[PDB]
Amino acid sequence: YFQSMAVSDPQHAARLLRALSSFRERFCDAHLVLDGEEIPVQKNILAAASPYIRTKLNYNPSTYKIELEGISVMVMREILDYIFSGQIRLNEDTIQDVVQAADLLLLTDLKTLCCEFL
Amino acid sequence: YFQSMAVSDPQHAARLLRALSSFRERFCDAHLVLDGEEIPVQKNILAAASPYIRTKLNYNPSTYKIELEGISVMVMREILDYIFSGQIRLNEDTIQDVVQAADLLLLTDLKTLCCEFL
């Protein structure tokens, strides 16, 4: 008989995500424009996490800007922290704003994670 | 008392990785040059996975090319499949070439995964 194998490392994705977290200061391809604030950002990772941002880039393609005024800077920074780790931070005064932000950005699993703590 | 929480979704990294896997055809920032073959590639994800490629980009910064002639095209494609999934494919005729490639690219965990099947 002849044998071939497909071996899977389930910690790989978490590990790659931590190396990508290091690059949030060369690799930045775009700026998120929220309030009058600009956050340098890696395009493919935000497009990957948020279907909204994915669609926005198809329809809204010299620094490249992705506009977002319907979410505060503090909340988006906690969401970006989520995107690069899988962990979100939640207070009594915050969880509602985060759930609404998650809805805007079509972060469907973040939203489900937030509602389970209500 | 006042209470804040940090909630962690451990499937998040795998899920983001699958959305990034979709983009391997806009998001491509560079070409891998192996043999006389060019593979359009997302820069930050290869830099993140491979410390070698990370270093190469610091020292070797108009399409941007990352040169790599010490690995075959077939093997690198299986490695790129690993990078975007955590799964590697391994035959009797292949595992040695993959282990050597993993060493070149400083893919330390891929290498450990490959040696466990020897």
Q: Which letter, b or e, does each residue of B51-85 get, where b requires 16 or more Cβ atoms within 10 Å of its Cβ? A: ebbbebbeeeeeeeebebeebeeebbebbbbbbbb
Chain B contacts in chain A segment 60-79 (CB below 8 A): none
Nearest to B87 among A8, A27, A43 (CB): A8
Long-range contacts of A87-90 (CB under 8 A, 24+ apart): A87/B6, A87/B7, A87/B8, A87/B9, A88/A113, A88/A114, A88/B6, A88/B7, A88/B9, A89/B4, A89/B5, A89/B6, A90/A114, A90/A117, A90/B4, A90/B5, A90/B6, A90/B7
Q: Decide if B36 touches A, using CB distance below 8 A.
A: no
B27–A43: do the CB atoms touch at under 8 Å?
yes
Please, are residues B27 and A29 in contact by the beta-carbon 8 Å criterion?
no
- Residue A117: list chain B partners with CB under 8 A: 5, 7
Backbone angles phi, psi at B40, to 5 degrees: -60, 135
Domains of chain B (ranges, CATH numbers) = 11-118 (3.30.710.10)
State how far the Cα of B40 lies from the Cα of A35, in Å rounded to an integer: 35
Looking at the complex, report in whole angstroms how far the Cα of residue A85 sits from the nearest Cα belonging to chain B.
7
Integer-rounded Cα Rg, in Å, for chain B is 17
How far is the alpha carbon of A82 from chain B, nearest alpha carbon, in Å?
8
B68 to each of A107, B81, B82, B105, how far by Cα in Å? 37, 17, 17, 10
Give the separation between CA B35 and CA B70, rounded to whole angstroms.
9
Ranges of beta strands (E only) in A9-117 are 30-34, 37-41, 65-67, 87-90
Resolution (A): 2.4
Method of determination?
Answer: X-ray
Whether residue B49 contacts residue A24, with contact meaning beta carbons closer than 8 Å, is answered with no
CB distance B13 to A14 below 8 Å: yes
